[PDB]
């Protein structure tokens, strides 16, 4: 089901919850072998 603030969960919320928490993420995923 869709919410009624979903669509603005997607820019309506801050560009900076997506930079790292994003990324950093993937930190362990694909592991940094380094």
């Known amino acids: 089901s869709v919410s009624?603030?979903?669509?603005?969960?997607?820019?309506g919320a801050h560009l900076n919850?997506?930079?790292?928490?994003?990324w950093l993420r993937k930190?362990?995923?694909?592991v940094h072998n380094f």
Request: hydrophobic share 40%; aromatic share 0%; proline share 0%.
């Open 4 to 11: 009624e603030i979903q669509l603005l969960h997607n820019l």
């Open 17 to 22: 919850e997506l930079e790292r928490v994003e």
């Open 27 to 30: 930190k362990l995923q694909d």
